[PDB]
Amino acid sequence: FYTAPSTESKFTEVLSKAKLQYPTSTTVAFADDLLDGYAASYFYLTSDLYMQFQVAGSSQRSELREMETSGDEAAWDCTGSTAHVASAQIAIPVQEDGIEEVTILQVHDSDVTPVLRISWVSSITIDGVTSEDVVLATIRNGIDDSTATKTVLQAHTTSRTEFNINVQNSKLSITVDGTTELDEADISQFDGSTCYFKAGAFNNNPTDTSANARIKMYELEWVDHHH
Numbered sequence: 001f002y003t004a005p006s007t008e009s010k011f012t013e014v015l016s017k018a019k020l021q022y023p024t025s026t027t028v029a030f031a032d033d034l035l036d037g038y039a040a041s042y043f044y045l046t047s048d049l050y051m052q053f054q055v056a057g058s059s060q061r062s063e064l065r066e067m068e069t070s071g072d073e074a075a076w077d078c079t080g081s082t083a084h085v086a087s088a089q090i091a092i093p094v095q096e097d098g099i100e101e102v103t104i105l106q107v108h109d110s111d112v113t114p115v116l117r118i119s120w121v122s123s124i125t126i127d128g129v130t131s132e133d134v135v136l137a138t139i140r141n142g143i144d145d146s147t148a149t150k151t152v153l154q155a156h157t158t159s160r161t162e163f164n165i166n167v168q169n170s171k172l173s174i175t176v177d178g179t180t181e182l183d184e185a186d187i188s189q190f191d192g193s194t195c196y197f198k199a200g201a202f203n204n205n206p207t208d209t210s211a212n213a214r215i216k217m218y219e220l221e222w223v224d225h226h227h
């Protein structure tokens with residue numbers, strides 16, 4: 001009884017350039033399935049026209065994964081001269097109790113390392129400063145270094161918020177509601193990797209493994225701009 005995101009033309013292009021992974025890294029719906037009206041409790045269109053992702057369980061996900069229209073997986077040079085841009089209008093509801101962090105957008109390499117995660121966190125402590133109920137950028141310091149550089153981007157609001165990730169040469173920038181919140185962070189540690197975008201709900205370290213993480217996107221796209 002769920003309405004498909006594909007019924008809104010604002011999502012046709014990104015769905016054509018995506019596959020849906022749920023509840024783990026297995027594909028449940030390819031582009032052609034998504035465009036044919038794929039809909040489920042973990043992926044549906046709300047009555048006010050948000051694409052809503054919902055999932056429970058530790059490290060479980062409902063997430064779109066960037067694809068080419070050819071059906072090739074996206075695998076662009078992480079540090080190449082072509083700009084890669086992901087834009088989304090995201091409403092982050094107040095999360096259920098037991099939900100501690102939800103990744104909503106990613107730049108991921110083609111193996112096992114996330115270049116960037118944008119995530120809601122109940123709390124984070126950075127260089128001695130604790131922030132609560134914020135949106136966070138996490139950039140991994142390298143494939144062989146589990147540590148990351150963390151940057152608070154925004155105080156959590158339920159209001160629809162514009163996020164832009166711009167990746168070009170060895171630099172990554174994030175804008176939030178038109179304001180640069182991460183200005184040309186270095187990602188040269190991913191020279192020689194290939195990369196793709198992800199977007200949705202990716203549930204990190206819940207304290208209640210049955211609670212549902214939930215994330216709503218009013219717009220979503222990922223594009224290239226050739227230099």
Ligand SMILES: O=C(O)[C@H]1O[C@@H](O[C@H]2[C@H](O)[C@H](O)[C@H](O[C@H]3[C@H](O)[C@H](O)[C@H](O[C@H]4[C@H](O)[C@H](O)[C@H](O[C@H]5[C@H](O)[C@H](O)[C@H](O[C@H]6[C@H](O)[C@H](O)[C@H](O)O[C@@H]6C(=O)O)O[C@@H]5C(=O)O)O[C@@H]4C(=O)O)O[C@@H]3C(=O)O)O[C@@H]2C(=O)O)[C@@H](O)[C@@H](O)[C@@H]1O
Nearest residue numbers: 025027065073108112113114125138140146147148150204
């Ligand atoms: O700063 C502090 O406060 C403390 O930080 C601590 O370290 C942190 C660290 O800073 C950072 O926060 C880190 O975050 C974790 C994160 O919680 C989460 O676990 C994340 O998960 C990753 C995985 O590591 C893995 O990369 C996985 O890869 C996926 C892909 O996403 C993709 O789905 C892929 O699909 C392909 C498969 O081939 C499929 O079969 C399919 O068919 O094809 C696809 C395809 O390519 O299309 O499959 C991959 C898979 O294997 O599942 O993706 C997730 C992800 O999506 O991001 O990992 C990060 C991380 O950076 O490791 O957590 C640390 C921590 O908690 O310890 C400490 O440093 C502390 O001292 C600080 O104080």
